[PDB]
């Protein structure tokens, strides 16, 4: 029951950020498309429909982010109303806070995988079909085993980050009444920013070839995953 | 049982807020922990519950050390907490949030959940609210549910936190009635608040702590007779 | 005229504007820095855009971050005075509401005289060598007479820079109407979220509905004045509503 | 002078929280405004001050209607408001708080403010602390500087909001001795707190409201022996 209360409450705040963070990304995708239309190609055409083919590419960021931002807004809302302090003052653990952040993360993972397998390729095949080897964006998920800069990893590191950002929020959305409610997100929001600045500057900096998922792209995914466990299992002896 | 709290201490940035307080409570006995707002009363109460981790101290619930445990593990072995502000589950029915705690106690069968939940709605007069959600009740109706589900965890020594908190004097004649009800079921209540004209009427013995150490204890007719409390707190009370 | 309340209600707003703008340009420095070393490797390690994009591109970023950090500090600083209950007690002593308005606007005179100071001498001179120090390894005076070397898209760029200080003075006017409008002792979290919402709407309304007016047909001098005047009318309507 | 109120009415959405409440405070006279919570006793108080705008009322000081006036223009007719919070200017010294509001009055010449300020710091025995800021004064100087600052704007009907409001019962003698001293200078005062044990022990009249309107307006010995107020309010034992 208390899991079905937590999943039903974050989902109404996750399906609301998905239509709020959409306007931020739609407008930002519309700023850069006007620079290539007031001086680029003639805009008697695609400018509405080309924007509609950018949504499964911008869904690679707003789908892990809406779960990350959704668990901050709800658990921040339930601590300050003293509903989680009274949750485990009458007998339950922090596991029910973790077993509610993963039964929800399974929902967003199978939308992130269906977005990154044969939905991103479907639009990028059609995006160049309206403007009428080394592609790595049209290329479907099976034949990413060929050669040098196959970026199968940035197509697989954003399905893992749906699960792993769901584990960093339940120990970091504790709110101290000294710091207030809006200041207890800057530990968590800056930590999300430090993840996608490294994940992007190891894909494009490592695509042309200096450092690849051999000793650099999956060690930052694992120092940042083991951080999500030692921060979550602080209730023991120190090591 | 015989919850005992010996030698509690704490340091906040070098400052000493509490040193060597010794308060006990037996079953079927309301003890009070009050004092002036110098840290004292507040931080000592948040160690018996367990939201504040101790510096050095020993809490035992009548046989066993629980002092190194969190709040949530202490709720399995007894102790049940009531927050000060409104802590009913806001979007859930009254029967649901009375059941969402009752689904966790694992020494019951699935047909014993429905009798025990029905035994609590009849006891606290909430049978006429079994479908209504939260955030739609009054300060005398929400407070009934907040106890009716913290009693559903099978506790010993419910310890309430400021359960007067600003309320008119006609609605303290029933807050005192459900508190004297819990004494008549074998649960030693530990009350702590600001409203000192009422807890000295309901308690059997109080623990006035002030400026660190515990300064006096005993029956409330010995409290007003004492002169040493009278310089820091309760100037010319009655 | 510059009393004690005048030098206190206009000082907290001056620091919280000046130390938000530092916290927004440093965040726009770092995520511009790691953007400019995924290109390095052509004879330039801290020279392409990594190292010397700190004095050469930062005065450009205190011009596109200055209006939405003037709505903000006049909301996050003035909202601080309303949270700890010092703005209702200024009115409860005689200091009126049009004298609060008169004292936040006296703060804006160092602000709008600074922005057109470094919007003419420092920002284009920095940004001009911000490309030369990159391309080697791979204003109002300077932009007025170039309107006749065409024979559109550039006259909008000049005319949206003269009353760009007017965009600063309108933001503190809108941030003042929110404090005398939907105030309700609303917590500090919402004043952060209504400071980003109308802050982001300004950035969209400046760069979308600036050129979109020009493409259809308009004089360019009113398309530059649209993102400030449409935020002057919202502040004016919000002021004359609760009476 | 006298401050009288005539037939207050206030309705937010449908329900009328206030329905025809009238009171009268004279000079040199404490009078409480009491009642249960949500019965309008915090709404008919703020209508006298002017935070919430009245609807059908008539607030009158001795020979001027002020019912249309906001708070900033009502504070010059001789009304002083003291909120139930800290309300000390934090980053401004304790001399400057009694100077920031002395410069508001225009009938005081520039030299005539300093001898008035040193008179106020001497009268409330706070002369010994002059350079302490206000972020760190006391629990007992967060209540004495507020009175010595709201007295500086030359009030006539200083309106307290919850003076006791959670202090020690040893500090209810020191925040009561300066309320009776506040009326000794010819200054009516209207307490409206919640803790009904000491507002009846300090006042001379009360105005207990219940859900829209007055119930009794006598001295405290005409209220404890009343029968109608002992059912929606205090109870059956108050000896
Ligand atoms: C709810 C709360 C939270 C909300 C969060 C919301 C988040 C929204 C995010 C939206 C964006 C998401 C993006 C994304 O998705 O996520 C990415 C990942 C990270 C995501 C993180 C997300 C989560 C965050 C979470 C936070 C916590 C919650 C990032 C991205 O996107 O990263 C990158 C992006 N990032 C950003 O902008 C930062 C991003 C980051 C994200 C946002 C972070 C926000 C955080 C907010 C919260 C903070 C909380 C604490 O923020 C922005 O945007 C800001 C947007 C507004 C934000 C508002 C935020 C607040 C909102 C609040 C709302 C309520 C970057 O931009 C760079 C700058 O651009 C302008 O600079 P300038 O203006 O110019 O100065 C900006 N100006 C501006 O923005 C203006 C703005 O007004 C300024 C700011 C305004 C602020 C307004 C504020 C409002 C405030 C309101 C109040 C607060 C700068 O601004 C900046 O810095 C911005 C500044 O910091 C500010 C930032 C924001 C600050 C915010 C503060 C907030 C404060 C409050 C809150 C605290 C900006 O940095 O571009 C990169 C791509 O570019 C490249 C590349 O590098 O690969 C090169 C491009 O070409 C150019 C160039 O354009 O420069 C020119 C070329 O000529 C060349 O020179 C080249 C290089 O030099 C070459 O060396 O460079 C182009 O090339 C291609 O096309 C060209 C042409 O056709 C079209 O152009 C061709 O030209 P040509 O052919 O010649 O025509 C090219 O040809 C060359 O190359 C060919 C090939 O080689 C190419 O290669 C292929 O072929 C090879 C083979 O051939 C051989 O092998 C292969 O080998 C290769 O592998 C490959 O296959 C050759 O072919 P051959 O012939 O040789 O074969 C050819 O010959 C020739 O050589 C080529 O083909 C391109 C293309 O994309 C794809 O093809 O690719 C992107 O990488 P990407 O990721 O990879 O794409
Ligand atoms: C002495 C003041 C020193 C202020 C130093 C500020 C350093 C931080 C500057 C930034 C900040 C406070 C952030 C929250 C925490 C502090 C809250 C403080 C409340 C004090 C009462 C002011 C604003 O956050 C910003 O977020 C962005 C996107 O949302 C908004 O757009 C901004 O518009 C603003 O919201
Ligand atoms: C386009 C203009 C939008 C104006 C929006 C005005 C309302 C914005 C905030 C209300 C929504 C709730 O948002 C939440 O509010 C709580 C309430 O304390 C804040 O705290 C949180 O930081 C914020 O996440
Ligand atoms: C986290 C930083 C951005 C916060 C943006 C506002 C979030 C609150 C508004 C969205 C929201 C809407 C519109 C909403 O309608 C809604 O309805 C039931 C919510 O429920 C939980 C919402 O969260
Ligand atoms: C229009 C382009 C900018 C959009 C900015 C986001 C607007 C939606 C999110 C903010 C928001 C929040 C959080 C919110 O809580 C809220 O509550 C009632 C809103 O009401 C209208 C909001 O707008």
Author numbering:
A (entry chain F): 2 to 133, 247 to 353
B (entry chain B): 2 to 239
C (entry chain G): 3 to 140, 250 to 262, 269 to 360
D (entry chain A): 2 to 240
What does the paper say about this structure?
To understand the mechanisms of how LptB2FGC recognises and acts to transport LPS, we obtained high-resolution cryo-electron microscopy (cryo-EM) structures of LptB2FGC complexed with substrate LPS or ATP analogue β-γ-imidoadenosine 5′-triphosphate (AMP-PNP).
We also obtained cryo-EM structure of LptB2FG complexed with LPS to compare the conformational changes with and without the presence of LptC. In this study, we used cryo-EM to resolve an LPS-bound structure of sfLptB2FG at overall 3.7 Å resolution with TM domain at 3.2 Å resolution. The densities for the periplasmic domains of LptF and LptG are at low resolution but are clearly visible. The LPS molecule trapped is a natural substrate of sfLptB2FG that was overexpressed in the E. coli C43(DE3) strain. In the cavity, hydrophobic residues I25, F26, L62, L66, L70 and M303 of LptF and L26, I33, I66, F67, I313, F317 and Y320 of LptG interact with the LPS acyl tails via van der Waals interactions. D37 of LptG interacts with the glucosamine disaccharide of lipid A. K322, R263 and Q248 of LptF and K41 of LptG interact with the inner core oligosaccharide.
